[PDB]
Amino acid sequence: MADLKAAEVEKAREHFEIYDWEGEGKIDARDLGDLLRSLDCKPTLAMVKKNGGSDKRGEKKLTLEEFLPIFSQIKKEKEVGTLEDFMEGLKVYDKAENGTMLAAELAHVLLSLGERLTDIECEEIMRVCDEDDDGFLKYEPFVKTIIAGPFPDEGK
C-alpha cells in the first residue's frame, strides 16, 4: 500500500494552511490546481478535475480530510517527463541542422495547441532574452533553463 510519511504530511499541512485565506480551513476546487503544483506534483488540468476540481471559481470546498485522499491518489503517476523527450521533440523544427529558432515561430508553438499559454505569458518568456536581432533563440539553453527553474544560478 502507500500512505503519507511524517515529512510529507508536513509538506501537505504547510501548503494547505497557507491556502486558507478565509479563516475556516478550506480550499476551493479551482485552487486544487496550483496547490498540488506547489506540492511539486506536476499535473494537467485534466489531472486536477479528475479528482474533483473546477474551471470556475466558487463551486465546491474541500477539507484536509478530503484533500489528503486527493494527494495520496495523485502520487501514483509515473509519466512526468524527462529532458530527452523534449530535445527529440524540439529538434523537429530543423531544416538545416542548426538547432536555432526564430522568435515568432517559437511564440506561436507556445500559444496554439494544448492547455496553452497566453499572449501575455509569451511576452514574459521572451523577457530574459536581450539583444539578438532578426531573431534567433537556441533549443539547448532554452530547455535547460525551463528544467532549472526561476533561479538556477542567476535569477531575476
Binding site: 522568435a103 515568432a104 511564440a107 532578426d134 531573431g135
Partner: protein, 48 residues
C-alpha cells in the same frame, strides 16, 4: 502597402494615389454628385 513589425503586430501603411476626377468640378453629367466633403460642410456647419 500595409506594414507589420518584428513580433506579430502592426507597423504602418504606405498608400499612393493614381488619378482623380478633377474634370467634373465644372458641371457633372447625369444625377452624379460632386465630392462628398462639400455637402457635409454645407449642412453640418454652424452659423459662426
Amino acid at each position: 502597402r500595409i506594414h507589420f513589425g518584428p513580433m506579430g503586430k502592426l507597423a504602418g501603411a504606405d498608400i499612393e494615389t493614381y488619378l482623380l476626377e478633377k474634370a467634373r468640378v465644372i458641371s457633372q453629367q447625369t444625377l452624379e454628385r460632386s465630392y462628398h466633403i462639400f455637402y457635409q460642410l454645407m449642412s453640418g456647419g454652424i452659423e459662426n
